[PDB]
């Protein structure tokens, strides 16, 4: 009986958690950014690669950059924000903004109010998180969904 759960929100839309992204609470659905081409050679998608192995599930939906591909297992929905076309494509605010719109509106249809995502975007400071965090809240306005960001 040793289970240290990190249920620690309440502050703003976004709450930052340092820890494992898969150690997220069962009530929380999970989101992150991927390419529409879904070639996963890097990113947190490679972790989902072993965990859910739903690359084809995504591609069979055929989403474009600006849309979100969702995987339902049970309890939580996995949000694959299609942020960029090719895998080496780098996220844009508007593309990410669109994936957030898609994602946030979907949560309403399912009754999702808890979401967890890692360091979304890509390994570039070209997008400034200050704009990202604001944009998330700007998109999320009028929702009741929490945002839990795991830092990596």
Question: What is the CATH classification number for the domain harbouring 148?
Answer: 3.40.220.10
Find out whether 28 is annotated in a ligand binding site: no
On whether residue 1 sits in a domain, the answer given is: no
- What is the edge-to-edge ordering of all strands in the sheet holding 114-117? 14-17, 146-150, 114-117, 29-35, 76-84, 68-74
On whether residue 86 sits in a domain, the answer given is: yes
**What is the Cα–Cα distance from 115 to 76, expressed in whole angstroms?**
9
On whether residue 46 sits in a domain, the answer given is: yes
Instruction: Give the residue from 72, 65, 70 showing the smallest Cα distance to 80.
Output: 70
**What is the Cα–Cα distance from 113 to 125, expressed in whole angstroms?**
29
Crossing angle, helix 129-140 and helix 93-110, to 10 degrees? 40
Catalytic residues: 84, 125
Residue 147 host element (H or E): strand 146-150
Instruction: Give the residue from 41, 40, 13 showing the smallest Cα distance to 117.
Output: 13
Contact 99, 68 (CB under 8 A): yes
Find out whether 124 is annotated in a ligand binding site: yes
Contact 106, 63 (CB under 8 A): no
Residue 104: phi, psi to the nearest 5? Answer: -65, -45
On whether residue 75 sits in a domain, the answer given is: yes
Query: What letter does residue 68 receive in the DSSP assignment?
Result: E
The domain total for the chain is 1
- Could you tell me the two tokens for 33? 């950014």
On whether residue 146 sits in a domain, the answer given is: yes
On whether residue 33 sits in a domain, the answer given is: yes
Find the domain containing 108 and state its range. 13-152
Find out whether 152 is annotated in a ligand binding site: yes
**What is the Cα–Cα distance from 108 to 135, expressed in whole angstroms?**
19
Helical spans, DSSP H, in the chain:
45-51, 55-59, 93-110, 129-140
On whether residue 107 sits in a domain, the answer given is: yes
Query: What letter does residue 90 receive in the DSSP assignment?
Result: P
CB atoms within 10 A of CB 25: 15
Find out whether 11 is annotated in a ligand binding site: no
Find out whether 19 is annotated in a ligand binding site: no
On whether residue 147 sits in a domain, the answer given is: yes
The SS3 of residue 18 is coil
Buried b (16+ CB within 10 A) or exposed e, 27-66: ebbbbbbbbbebebeebbbeebeeeeebbebbeebebebb
Residue 38: phi, psi to the nearest 5? Answer: 60, 15
Experimental technique: NMR
């Amino acid at each position: 009986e040793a289970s240290s759960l990190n249920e620690d929100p309440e502050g703003s839309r976004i709450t930052y958690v340092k820890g494992d992204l898969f150690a997220c609470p069962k009530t929380d659905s999970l989101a992150h950014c991927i390419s529409e081409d879904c070639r996963m050679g890097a990113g947190i998608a490679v972790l989902f690669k072993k965990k859910f192995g739903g690359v084809q599930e995504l591609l069979n939906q055929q989403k474009k950059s600006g849309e979100v591909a969702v995987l339902k297992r049970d309890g939580r929905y996995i949000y694959y924000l299609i942020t960029k076309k090719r895998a080496s494509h780098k996220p844009t605010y508007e593309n990410l903004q669109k994936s957030l719109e898609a994602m946030k509106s979907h949560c309403l249809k399912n009754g999702v109010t808890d979401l967890s995502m890692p360091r979304i975007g890509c390994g570039l400071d070209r997008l400034q998180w200050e704009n990202v965090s604001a944009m998330i809240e700007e998109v999320f306005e009028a929702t009741d969904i929490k945002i839990t960001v795991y830092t990596l």
